[PDB]
Amino acid sequence: ANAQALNSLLQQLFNKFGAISSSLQEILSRLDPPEAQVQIDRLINGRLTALNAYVSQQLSDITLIKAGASRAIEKVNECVKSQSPRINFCGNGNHILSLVQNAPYGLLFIHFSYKPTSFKTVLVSPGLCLSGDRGIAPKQGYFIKQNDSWMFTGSSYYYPEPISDKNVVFMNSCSVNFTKAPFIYLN
Amino acid sequence: TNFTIAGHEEFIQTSSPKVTIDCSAFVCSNYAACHDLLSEYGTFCDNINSILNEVNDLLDITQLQVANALMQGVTLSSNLNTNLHSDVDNIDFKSLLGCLGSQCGSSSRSPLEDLLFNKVKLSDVGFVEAYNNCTGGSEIRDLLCVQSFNGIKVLPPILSETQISGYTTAATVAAMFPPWSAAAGVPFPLNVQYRINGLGVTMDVLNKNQKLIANAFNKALLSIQNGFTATPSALAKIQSVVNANAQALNSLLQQLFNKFGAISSSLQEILSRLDPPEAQVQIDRLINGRLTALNAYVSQQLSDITLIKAGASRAIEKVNECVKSQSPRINFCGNGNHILSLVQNAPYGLLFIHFSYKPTSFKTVLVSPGLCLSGDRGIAPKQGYFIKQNDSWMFTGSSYYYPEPISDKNVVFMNSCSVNFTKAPFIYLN
Amino acid sequence: NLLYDSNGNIIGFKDFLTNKTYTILPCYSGRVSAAFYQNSSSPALLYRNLKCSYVLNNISFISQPFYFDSYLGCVLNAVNLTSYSVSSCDLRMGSGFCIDYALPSSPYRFVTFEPFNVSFVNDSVETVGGLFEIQIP
Ligand SMILES: *[C@@H]1O[C@H](CO)[C@@H](O[C@@H]2O[C@H](CO)[C@@H](O[C@@H]3O[C@H](CO)[C@@H](O)[C@H](O)[C@@H]3O)[C@H](O)[C@H]2NC(C)=O)[C@H](O)[C@H]1NC(C)=O
Ligand SMILES: *[C@@H]1O[C@H](CO)[C@@H](O)[C@H](O)[C@H]1NC(C)=O
Numbered sequence: 001a002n003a004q005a006l007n008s009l010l011q012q013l014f015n016k017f018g019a020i021s022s023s024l025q026e027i028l029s030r031l032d033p034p035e036a037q038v039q040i041d042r043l044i045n046g047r048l049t050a051l052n053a054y055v056s057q058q059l060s061d062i063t064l065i066k067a068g069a070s071r072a073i074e075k076v077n078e079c080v081k082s083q084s085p086r087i088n089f090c091g092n093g094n095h096i097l098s099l100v101q102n103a104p105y106g107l108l109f110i111h112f113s114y115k116p117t118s119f120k121t122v123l124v125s126p127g128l129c130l131s132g133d134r135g136i137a138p139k140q141g142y143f144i145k146q147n148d149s150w151m152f153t154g155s156s157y158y159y160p161e162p163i164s165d166k167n168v169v170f171m172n173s174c175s176v177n178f179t180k181a182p183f184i185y186l187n
Numbered sequence: 188t189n190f191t192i193a194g195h196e197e198f199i200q201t202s203s204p205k206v207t208i209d210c211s212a213f214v215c216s217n218y219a220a221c222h223d224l225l226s227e228y229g230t231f232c233d234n235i236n237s238i239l240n241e242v243n244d245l246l247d248i249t250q251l252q253v254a255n256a257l258m259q260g261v262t263l264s265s266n267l268n269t270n271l272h273s274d275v276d277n278i279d280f281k282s283l284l285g286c287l288g289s290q291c292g293s294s295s296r297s298p299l300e301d302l303l304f305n306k307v308k309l310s311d312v313g314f315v316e317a318y319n320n321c322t323g324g325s326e327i328r329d330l331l332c333v334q335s336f337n338g339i340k341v342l343p344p345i346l347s348e349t350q351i352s353g354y355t356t357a358a359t360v361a362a363m364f365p366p367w368s369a370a371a372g373v374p375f376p377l378n379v380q381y382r383i384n385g386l387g388v389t390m391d392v393l394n395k396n397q398k399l400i401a402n403a404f405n406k407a408l409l410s411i412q413n414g415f416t417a418t419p420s421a422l423a424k425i426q427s428v429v430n431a432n433a434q435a436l437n438s439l440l441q442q443l444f445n446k447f448g449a450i451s452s453s454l455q456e457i458l459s460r461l462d463p464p465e466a467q468v469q470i471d472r473l474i475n476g477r478l479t480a481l482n483a484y485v486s487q488q489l490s491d492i493t494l495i496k497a498g499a500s501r502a503i504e505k506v507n508e509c510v511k512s513q514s515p516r517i518n519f520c521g522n523g524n525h526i527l528s529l530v531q532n533a534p535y536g537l538l539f540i541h542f543s544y545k546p547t548s549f550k551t552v553l554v555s556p557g558l559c560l561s562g563d564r565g566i567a568p569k570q571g572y573f574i575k576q577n578d579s580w581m582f583t584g585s586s587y588y589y590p591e592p593i594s595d596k597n598v599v600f601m602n603s604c605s606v607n608f609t610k611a612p613f614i615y616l617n
Numbered sequence: 618n619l620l621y622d623s624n625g626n627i628i629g630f631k632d633f634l635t636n637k638t639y640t641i642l643p644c645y646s647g648r649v650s651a652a653f654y655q656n657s658s659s660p661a662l663l664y665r666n667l668k669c670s671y672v673l674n675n676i677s678f679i680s681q682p683f684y685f686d687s688y689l690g691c692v693l694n695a696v697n698l699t700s701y702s703v704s705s706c707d708l709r710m711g712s713g714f715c716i717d718y719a720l721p722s723s724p725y726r727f728v729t730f731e732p733f734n735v736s737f738v739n740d741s742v743e744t745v746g747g748l749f750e751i752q753i754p
Contacts, residue, residue: 087514171390175397
């Protein structure tokens with residue numbers, strides 16, 4: 001696009017623009033001096049208009065260029081040299097880390113993500129209530145029922161583990177939509 | 188002491204109507220004697236067409252980006268809403284959902300979007316319905332038919348409004364039924380409780396006022412739906428954009444009736460009254476005037492497309508970081524206390540629905556930023572304060588008054604206490 | 618003897634030798650959008666906002682063996698195959714439609730443009746036995 005613009009800017013020097021010849025040499029030594037300004041002015045007006053249009057196009061493009069560059073700077077500072085807690089910014093939700101490389105007229109990014117391959121269906125419970133009007137809710141995971149017993153699994157893997165203090169939050173009440181389990185004596 | 192939930196709407200412009208101008212149909216004439224002189228200017232009208240095409244390409248690119256941001260990481264079940272219960276946990280979401288079942292085709296707009304689309308005439312379908320009437324028999328006078336025959340016509344986008352409405356109503360049900368993609372795998376009421384818990388409200392009051400939260404959500408949705416009968420700000424901005432586009436299109440057409448130092452605005456009168464060898468001056472004057480007008484128009488378009496792109500990027504960022512996921516950034520998705528956010532399709536942009544946490548009653552109480560325990564040990568509260576009740580130290584939240592005993596789950600420990608901390612040797616672990 | 622509008626447009630005329638009133642409507646002057654493949658032989662014409670009942674007898678006198686009306690005007694040298702959708706398309710027309718080329722009648726096919734989809738899973742929505750049912754990697 002830059003080369004096409006530069007080539008189109010040069011081709012405007014071979015235009016007549018309402019004159020008798022598209023050349024400043026074929027006008028001077030072809031008429032009397034008083035009858036040359038009328039054509040030189042018309043030759044100058046078109047070139048000035050073309051230059052103004054080119055300057056306007058450059059001013060319109062530089063704004064988007066600077067906006068993209070600022071976005072690139074922000075993305076570098078928030079994804080390469082740091083791990084921001086922002087989601088759906090450096091990747092597609094499962095972003096891990098990113099690297100930066102030099103590229104012609106810009107920069108190159110390499111985003112690493114977390115892509116699962118296999119899946120497995122399982123019934124989950126979004127919270128339980130223990131004996132004594134006490135309720136518990138999982139933190140980044142679910143509650144499964146394996147061998148008439150409740151366990152805890154992650155939201156992105158299926159490795160069962162027993163319920164502990166660092167894997168569940170404690171509440172002093174629970175609604176009627178949760179599942180009752182009075183045999184979980186893991187306080 | 189008491190709280191409620193309030194709603195708030197917001198509109199962000201994303202797209203703009205695509206305008207196309209003809210090279211020779213508008214500059215000189217449908218004739219040929221004028222075109223024989225326009226060739227002396229070289230490829231001057233080709234450069235005008237090398238700007239609107241790029242503007243339309245940028246508009247298509249940003250529309251595809253918005254669609255991708257709406258449809259990224261979204262998975263639904265096969266047993267979809269086939270006339271099923273659109274309400275979950277006493278929360279009526281039917282007023283902002285279309286239809287995604289096997290039936291109900293060729294129409295996917297929600298009842299909320301219909302109120303917005305029925306108050307604008309120059310929508311995506313409006314130009315299509317107003318342009319095809321210029322042949323089968325239109326009214327006595329129509330501006331769009333006159334502008335179309337002179338080289339000014341508005342092209343429809345690459346994606347219809349129905350597809351955008353479908354994308355929106357599919358992204359809305361994401362955080363409504365398992366699996367919860369837009370809630371990171373958390374049910375809707377538990378997600379709302381987690382959102383409102385981060386402000387300082389304890390879990391003891393949330394479980395006792397679930398029906399209150401449901402009624403507050405229903406009342407907020409009803410107030411947002413009924414607020415479109417009057418003149419709101421989003422509809423005002425949409426009408427302003429439409430009127431500005433119409434005024435620009437009408438002002439661009441009036442340049443064909445100016446004189447521009449010539450003898451007459453009509454080009455046929457100059458060629459049917461004066462001899463050939465003197466009409467070139469008038470033709471050149473008219474050509475220069477109309478080319479200057481077209482250059483001014485394309486310059487204004489290039490000036491507006493930058494702000495359009497900026498608004499579209501802002502809308503994309505909001506869609507990515509407010510509705511599909513929660514970002515720990517205050518005063519970004521709303522006004523202070525922010526809980527959730529919803530997106531709806533709007534003419535030439537998107538419509539957002541923000542839910543906030545608005546208290547009702549207040550109470551004055553004495554608080555302490557920290558106390559010193561026995562043994563030069565320190566302790567400071569987190570997301571709350573320290574209050575005294577019946578000559579005993581307890582803990583309370585920063586957004587709700589509910590005393591609770593001090594435990595290791597609500598405070599932090601320090602190896603040294605400051606000199607401006609209230610002494611309290613009576614408390615050991617209570 | 619003349620009727621004008623708000624901004625300098627003649628939209629009427631009265632004759633003085635016949636005492637009859639007429640109405641002036643401008644003539645048709647529009648372009649055509651034609652999609653052309655890499656090494657095809659004839660593009661796919663598209664007259665926007667024009668029915669083929671008016672094009673086949675007032676615009677183009679060439680015998681067109683293929684024509685059918687659509688949402689954006691009738692398309693020439695194409696087939697009505699809107700029941701088939703594509704993901705990526707290089708000839709975009711608008712309103713969710715595009716034209717793709719298939720190497721063989723009319724090789725141009727008028728299809729639907731659906732660039733984004735959603736992953737479907739065969740699971741239940743309502744709670745079964747008080748528990749949900751989701752997929753875990
Ligand atoms: C088109 O319409 C005009 C307007 O009506 C017609 O002009 C009218 O023509 C009639 C018949 O010639 C005139 O009536 C005459 O009036 C004189 C008195 O002035 C009377 O002595 C005659 O016996 C006759 O009744 C009428 O005045 C005249 N109106 C005007 C305003 O000039 C015209 O004839 C119509 N043209 C055609 C082709 O029908
Ligand atoms: C939609 O499906 C098509 C065809 O399977 C595929 O090419 C395209 O990448 C899909 N889009 C998304 C967003 O998954």
